[model samples]
Target: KESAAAKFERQHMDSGNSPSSSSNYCNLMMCCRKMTQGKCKPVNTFVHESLADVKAVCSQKKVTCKNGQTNCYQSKSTMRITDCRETGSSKYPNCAYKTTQVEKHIIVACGGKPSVPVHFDASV
Candidate 1:
């Protein structure tokens, strides 16, 4: 079974590529990460931070989530992230995306003994 934590990693973590170059990092990786199947994921985001750095948020501090969950925490430090916005022409199997990147503080929901990201709450 795919755990929520594992799904979070698949959906958001992407440390190998950064926005330092103008190269787009979304279109290919979204398909590579399996989010472009069936219908396209219209909007998605990826964290360029390490998994270890992200999971540590579970214990760093806790805050209320947008939906009111109390397990969410704002990253103690800013992180590099990128957004994948589906293009207007992307209709079906071949979904397309434009990459946008920025450095910002992130919020994530975490859980479990080894604490891991259960969801990405938001970024500021």
Candidate 2:
């Protein structure tokens, strides 16, 4: 089984593709990365920053998770990120997305016995 940290890296990390040009970026990536396997992921965000910066978020300020969990953290500075939201007409096996890139402070949910990130919560 894949570890939580590994899963987080697979779904959220995108060190390159910055200043994303291709309109098909989200369409291609969300699928190629296996996020569209069974059903379309309604909303997802891809970070264009370095993995070191991402991992450092775990040491940032603690915050309350959307679900009211206590293990969430918020990044101290804004980072480059791409937001992918499914189109209204999109259906299974044909996931279409609207891509928007922005700089924002991100929120993430962390876990593990030693306490590492397990999910990308939100960005603001």
Candidate 3:
């Protein structure tokens, strides 16, 4: 059995991010920002680095930030399932391949308007 500390650590890591969590939110936020500014570059490297830093934490925690196969014992046994897969492919395969859809909020500050939303026509 996983120790209490291990379980706590796992939960902490799990809470950090998932496929549709932090990354998607960040992407959506960035996308919205780009819409208003045409190209919204990070004010400093540290700003972009901050996102990378959080992603690194999520990655180190062994969280599934992207959809793909992961290996582990099945339930409470030593046996494993090796062929995990993502369900319901996206509308745009190459342009948008993510299964997670994060909600992003944007507040207009100065001389900018909201960008046009990108709608996907996924069949799955």
Q: In model 1, how many backbone clashes occur? A: 0
Better of 1 and 3 by TM-score: 1
State which candidate, 1 or 3, has the greater lDDT: 1
- Arrange candidates, best lDDT first: 2, 1, 3
lDDT of 1: 0.85
Better of 2 and 3 by lDDT: 2
Q: What C-alpha lDDT, on a 0 to 100 scale, does residue 14 get in candidate 3? A: 56
Please count the clashing residue pairs in each candidate, in the order shown: 0, 0, 1
lDDT per residue for candidate 1 within 57-113, as digits (tens), equals 777767999998898998888899988889989988889898888898889988887
- For every candidate structure, what is the RMSD over all alpha carbons to the true structure, in angstroms? 11.5, 11.4, 20.8
For model 1, the superposed segments whose C-alpha errors exceed 4 Å read: 1-23
Reference-based lDDT, residue 122, model 3? 13
**What tens-digit string does per-residue lDDT give for candidate 3 at 4-98?**
99998867765656754453443344345442143333221112223333222222212111233231111111111111112243222212112
Alpha-carbon deviation at 37 in model 3, angstroms: 44
